[PDB]
Amino acid sequence: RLVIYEREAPEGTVKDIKEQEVYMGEIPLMTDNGTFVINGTERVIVSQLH
Amino acid sequence: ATWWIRQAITRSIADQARTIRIPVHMIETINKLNRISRQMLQEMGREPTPEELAERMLMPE
Amino acid sequence: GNRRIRSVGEMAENQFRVGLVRVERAVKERLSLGDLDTLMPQDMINAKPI
Lengths: 50, 61, 50
Description:
Protein name (chain B): RNA polymerase sigma factor RpoD
Order of helices and strands of chain B: HHH
Largest sheet of chain B: none
Oligomer: part of a larger assembly
Radius of gyration of chain B: 15 Å
Helix content of chain A: under 10%
Number of helices of chain B: 3
Shape of chain B: elongated
Protein name (chain C): DNA-directed RNA polymerase subunit beta
Strand content of chain A: 25-35%
Structural class of chain A: mainly beta
Family (chain C): Belongs to the RNA polymerase beta chain family.
Helix content of chain B: 55-70%
Radius of gyration of chain A: 22 Å
Distance between the termini of chain A: 38 Å
Number of strands of chain B: 0
Largest sheet of chain A: 2 strands, antiparallel
Structural class of chain B: mainly alpha
Largest interface: A-C, 21 and 21 residues
Shape of chain A: elongated
Family (chain B): Belongs to the sigma-70 factor family. RpoD/SigA subfamily.
Subcellular location (chain B): Cytoplasm
């Protein structure tokens, strides 16, 4: 949602255009067994302890 | 001077800034491609096909 | 008790966050000069960066 507030407000918007679901990135998905397929190859992300 | 100074910078960057020197027309072409991939990246939802930028661009593609 | 366990979900959350800060500079940057109703929340937010 893009809102533009009127210059020297009381704050109110001239126009707000709502862009329907803009695509940003493809986030990887986890297998039913908990591995990811990065490039055609099964991969595990090890838990870290800090 | 802004025009002259700005002219010298760009003309210099184009000329000596690459390890393989490229003619000026080559540089402008490349940037033109980056621009289309920008709009077309999210515009297409995946990203433009290798031949996609070809039709948007004038040349043999 | 001072040793915490991460795992894939948390790491990806941090990584996706980084995409959002580096697109942020862009969003402000475009909203810097923007014409009113021409641009929309698409021409600004990119994909490759996020």
